[PDB]
């Protein structure tokens, strides 16, 4: 760690800290993710083991590059390429003006390409949210923070119930399905898409039930017709209020027909009918996609 100059703390967690740093010898600017092992009587945390092993396989323009791993007795350092900022900070800075539609389309298109690459390499992200998405000055956006990621099997089996951040969490998880898969990542991206368009979180719940109801009030309460098997889910209650589906013209006003079409398919209740990353990329919404530069 002699060769790294810490420039500033850009993130923090329970496992450690994230720094912006520069290589003293080459000048390279990097992101340094520090993970404590001393506070670890369990050795190397499973979260780190998964993040590192899965990132090493994921070589794609829209996935953050892991440059190095430094493993010592007391500490573990992950070295990443440095990007200007995360999508949350960008959205906050754009909260008044709005992100131009051509840029929103470019970001979604890129996110879908990164996600499709993940899924094609049997990796679930499970923590897609704006703060885990990184943008550079040239118009690129990349998936990051694979600390909750997991390699999955075909067919899948029961994985960890407590995963995605509440606001971005899919209804099959909220309702406690024994099985979830790639569709949970698409749901998260759907929420992020709408968030970019409207400048605010689509479903900002403050509890699991509140989260569920916010979804129900917008997309309508699911039934056996819209979602076969739903009334048999572990945390489904027949006493749920029955709300009607809202018109997307009200949910995402700025969005054209194709945008509304794609968004609704990304937020389909039934995981088996929900659009895949691959299919999403072929949606007419993207027929005119360009790569505009953001405004920083």
């Amino acid at each position: 760690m002699e060769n790294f100059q810490k420039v500033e703390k850009i993130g923090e967690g329970t496992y450690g800290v994230v720094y912006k740093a520069r290589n003293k010898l080459t000048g390279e600017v990097v992101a340094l993710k520090k993970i404590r092992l001393d506070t670890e009587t369990e050795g190397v945390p499973s979260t780190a083991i998964r993040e590192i092993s899965l990132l090493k396989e994921l070589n794609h323009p829209n996935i953050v590059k892991l440059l190095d791993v430094i493993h010592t007795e007391n500490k573990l350092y992950l070295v990443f390429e440095f990007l200007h900022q995360d999508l949350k900070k960008f959205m906050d800075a754009s909260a008044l003006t709005g992100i131009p539609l051509p840029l929103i389309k470019s970001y979604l298109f890129q996110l879908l390409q990164g996600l499709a690459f993940c899924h094609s390499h049997r990796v679930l992200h499970r923590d897609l949210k704006p703060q885990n998405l990184l943008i550079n000055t040239e118009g690129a956006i990349k998936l990051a923070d694979f600390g909750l990621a997991r390699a999955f099997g075909v067919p899948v089996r029961t994985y960890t119930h407590e995963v995605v951040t509440l606001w971005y969490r899919a209804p099959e998880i909220l309702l406690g399905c024994k099985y979830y898969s790639t569709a949970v990542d698409i749901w998260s991206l759907g929420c992020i898409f709408a968030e970019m368009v409207t400048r605010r979180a689509l479903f900002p719940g403050d509890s699991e039930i509140d989260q569920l109801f916010r979804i129900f009030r917008t997309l309508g309460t699911p039934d056996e017709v819209v979602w076969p098997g739903v009334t048999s889910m572990p945390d489904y209650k027949p006493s749920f209020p029955k709300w009607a589906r809202q018109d997307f013209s009200k949910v995402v006003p700025p969005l054209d027909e194709d945008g509304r079409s794609l968004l609704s398919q990304m937020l389909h209740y039934d995981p088996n009918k929900r659009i895949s990353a691959k299919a999403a990329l072929a949606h007419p919404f993207f027929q005119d996609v360009t790569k505009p530069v953001p405004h920083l």
Partner: protein
């Protein structure tokens, strides 16, 4: 996930070649032997049962072990340390609830200390360079199972049993890729339970014809026939359970197609 199924299979077929251990590594180990490796793996089977770990976790641990031994000389007194750290790492990778290190220490009856197991975890990680996401016979099996409609749980239990038996005997199974071992196991299991043969749909997807499975299939058939006589018995005991349809009690076929 039918949209990615094909891509994933293709990817796994590329990875299994990269994560493949060195076929003849035991000749170059000065102190340990195939018989000692068999004893280790048989013991890992029991450990997995004790802690109700996934079969996938077991398969990963074996992969880690064989790759580690492919480049590191290990004395017989330390082989179980390598095995324990491997199971710990596989648990952390694969399980929702990995056992804590103190439990791994306990399961070895204090043969090693916590410090030793943690230090061995570090060494294994370094030697494998954190490349832990290996394809296993298990992963290919579950994909192959999808070609059964409706599903046949007995055929699945038997296939898993046969696949697990292959972990014990480095000679000869180290020379076959997981995808190929999984194909022979699936065919043999299907043939035994239903008298049917490896599907045309699987021949197309995998590129393996029934003839290309033959070499591995002949070995697997012998292993199956002689299973009750093998020195290691933890897998048979495991698969006598009703949750596995007591498939280890089924009589293997005398001859093949």
């Amino acid at each position: 996930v039918p949209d990615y199924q094909e891509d994933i299979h293709t990817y796994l077929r590329e990875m299994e070649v990269k994560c493949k251990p060195k076929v003849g590594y035991m000749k170059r180990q000065p102190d340990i032997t195939n018989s000692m490796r068999a004893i280790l793996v048989d013991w890992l089977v029991e450990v997995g049962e004790e802690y109700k770990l996934q079969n996938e976790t077991l398969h990963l641990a074996v992969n880690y072990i064989d790759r580690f031994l492919s480049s590191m000389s290990v004395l017989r007194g330390k082989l179980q340390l390598v095995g324990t750290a491997a199971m710990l790492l596989a648990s952390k990778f694969e399980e929702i609830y990995p056992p804590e290190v103190a439990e791994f220490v306990y399961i070895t009856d204090d043969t090693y200390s916590k410090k030793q197991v943690l230090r061995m975890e570090h060494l294994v990680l370094k030697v494998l360079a954190f490349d832990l996401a290996a394809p296993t016979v298990n992963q290919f099996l579950t994909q192959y199972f999808l070609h059964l409609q409706p599903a046949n749980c007995k055929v699945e239990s038997l296939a898993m049993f046969l696949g697990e038996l292959s972990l014990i005997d480095a000679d000869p199974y180290l020379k076959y890729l997981p995808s190929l071992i999984a194909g022979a196991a699936f065919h043999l299991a299907l043939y035994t339970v239903t008298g049917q043969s490896w599907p045309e749909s699987l021949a197309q997807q995998t590129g393996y014809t029934l003839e290309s499975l033959k070499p591995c299939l002949v070995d697997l058939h012998q292993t199956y026939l002689k299973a009750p006589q093998h020195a290691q018995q933890s897998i048979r005991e495991k698969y006598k359970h009703s949750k596995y349809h007591s498939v280890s009690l089924l009589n293997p076929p005398e001859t093949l197609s």
